[PDB]
Amino acid sequence: ITDSLANRTLIVTTILEEPYVMYRKSDKPLYGNDRFEGYCLDLLKELSNILGFLYDVKLVPDGKYGAQNDKGEWNGMVKELIDHRADLAVAPLTITYVREKVIDFSKPFMTLGISILYRKPNIIISSYTANLAAFLTVERMESPIDSADDLAKQTKIEYGAVRDGSTMTFFKKSKISTYEKMWAFMSSRQQSALVKNSDEGIQRVLTTDYALLMESTSIEYVTQRNCNLTQIGGLIDSKGYGVGTPIGSPYRDKITIAILQLQEEGKLHMMKEKWWRGNGCP
Amino acid sequence: IIISSYTANLAAFLTVERMESPIDSADDLAKQTKIEYGAVRDGSTMTFFKKSKISTYEKMWAFMSSRQ
């Protein structure tokens, strides 16, 4: 195999994410790399400066990574990367143990784990005191979520997951009661407790009390962007982070070198804080 | 009424510290994440739990092995 260089134009497939990929064509029409903006495009531009490589942003209908049954099934990014028909897929994807055999990831730079978000709903004297304290005691025995386990053993408050993620794969391979009961609730009701898109979960949370089992940065991002909710507890597990690259790609090593070089100077640290500034709690 | 509310809160607390405490059973400690429990590293307890298949050993071993 050889490396042919004319302009190093790369096939960069991607899908829309917040605050990663979003359009800028409402002030004047823009296309190609100018078609979008966000943290992802900023990373692309910074990497292009370091490597002297050209990238072309192009979209696909699906943003899912495919669900894993007892037989192999992959959708969206993963099949393209296996087939080597798209040079890069810079959509952010966490590292789980099963996806390391078909594609290469980059070394993690931001640490993460599953976490949950919570919507908020914002003689005579002796007898009256006894009656009042009778349910004052009851109201202090209610806490449907104070942990993942507590969320597991009740269903009066609805919870779900984003379609085709890593969470359901994690639950189905976990043999302890909490995760398998989460998965059993997810499969039941013909996926009506699941949302095909994150924004569907956003409307579910805004309308009623809806819980999502997903990565933390999304949770504290919604917290920083809405003051009617906050992150519950801490990280329940730890799993890696990376950028999708072809399996065995020589360009992956150079990309990792460049992102590490950006890592020592702490430029990504300030850069994410640029996108970590917005309107939430005053 | 406010004094009645204070008296009711005190009475509810008096009921509840005996409603809920003191309990420290091993199953209770295992089933809650409020209290952390573990042991030394590379000890005999983990080998015993891994070699065994009792559900209790499995759940405590999962708890320690959790959080990396």
Contact A63, A76 (CB under 8 A): yes
Do residue B58 and residue A175 have CB atoms under 8 angstroms apart? yes
8 A C-beta contact, residue A129 and residue B7:
yes
| Tokens 């790609």 found at | A249
Q: Give the gap in angstroms from C-alpha B54 to the nearest C-alpha of chain A.
A: 12
Q: Which residues contact B46 (CB under 8 A, 6 or more apart)?
A: B39, B61, B64
Helix (H, G, I), strand (E, B) or coil at B24: coil
A:B CB pairs within 8 Å: 44
Compute CA distances A196 → A72, A96, B37, whole Å: 21, 21, 38
| Residue B21 assigned as binding residue | no
Of residues A211, A204, A209, the one with CA closest to residue A185: A211
Q: Give the amino acid at A163.
A: R
User: Phi and psi at residue A93, in whole multiples of 5°?
Assistant: -135, 130
Which method resolved this structure?
cryo-EM
B→A interface, C-beta within 8 Å: 4-5, 7-9, 11-12, 15-16, 19, 31-34, 58-59, 62, 66-68
Q: Which two three-digit tokens encode residue B27?
A: 């199953």
The CA distance from A173 to the nearest CA of chain B, in Å, is: 13
Structure tokens at A198: 């994150």
Q: Which residues in chain A are contacts of B34 at CB distance < 8 A?
A: 147
Gap between the Cα atoms of B5 and A88, Å rounded: 64
Q: CA-CA-CA-CA torsion for B48, B52, B54, B57, nearest 10 degrees?
A: 30
Q: Which of A142, A149, A176 to probe the B interface (max B CBs under 10 A)? A: A176
Nearest Cα neighbor of A119 from A153, A152, A144 is A144
Is A88 exposed, middle or buried (CB count within 10 Å of its CB: 0-12, 13-18, 19+)? Answer: buried
Is B16–A137 a contact, with Cβ atoms under 8 angstroms apart?
A: yes
The secondary structure element, H or E, covering residue B50 is helix B44-51
Residues near A167 by beta carbon (within 8 Å), at least 6 away in sequence? A114, A161, A213, A214
Closest CA to A222 of A15, A16, A19, A43: A19
**B45 annotated among ligand-binding-site residues:** yes
Q: How many CA atoms lie within 13 A of A122 on its CB side?
A: 7
Structure token pair of residue A70: 């007892």
Dist CA A147 CA A79 (whole Å): 36
Contacts of A211 (CB under 8 A, 6+ apart): A116, A117, A118, A119, A145, A151, A157, A158, A159, A160
Chain A residue numbers with beta carbons less than 8 Å from the beta carbon of B21 are none
| C-beta of residue A157 within 8 angstroms of C-beta of residue A144 | yes
User: For the sheet containing A88-95, what is the strand order?
Assistant: A54-59, A9-14, A88-95, A240-244
- Percent helix, strand and coil across chain B, each to the nearest 5: 65, 0, 35
Work out the angle between the directed axes of helices A39-51 and A250-264 (0-180°, nearest 10). 100
Residue A55 to chain B, least CA–CA distance (Å): 37
Token pair 């429990």 in the structure block, residue: B37
Q: DSSP label at B33? A: S
Residue owning tokens 């996806």: A99
Measure the CA–CA gap between A73 and B6, rounded to whole angstroms: 61
The 3-state secondary structure of chain A reads CCCCCCCCEEEEEECCECCCEEECCCCCCCCHHHHEECHHHHHHHHHHHHHCCEEEEEECCCCCCCCCCCCCCCCCHHHHHHHCCCCEEEEEEEECHHHHHCCECCCCCCCECEEEEEECCCCHHHHHHHHHHHHHHHHCCCCCCCCHHHHHCCCCCEEECECCCCHHHHHHCCCCHHHHHHHHHHHHHHHCCCECCHHHHHHHHHHCCEEEEEEHHHHHHHHHHCCCEEEECCCCCCEEEEEEECCCCHHHHHHHHHHHHHHHCCHHHHHHHHHCCCCCCC
Task: Compute the nearest-CA separation of B58 from chain A (Å).
Answer: 8
| Four-CA torsion A222, A238, B59, A70, nearest 10 degrees | 90
On the CB side of A87, how many CA atoms lie within 13 Å of its CA? 15
Which of A46, A61, A55 minimizes the C-alpha distance to A88? A55
Q: Which residues pair with A118 in a beta bridge?
A: A230
Among A258, A211, A215, which Cα is nearest to A240's? Answer: A215
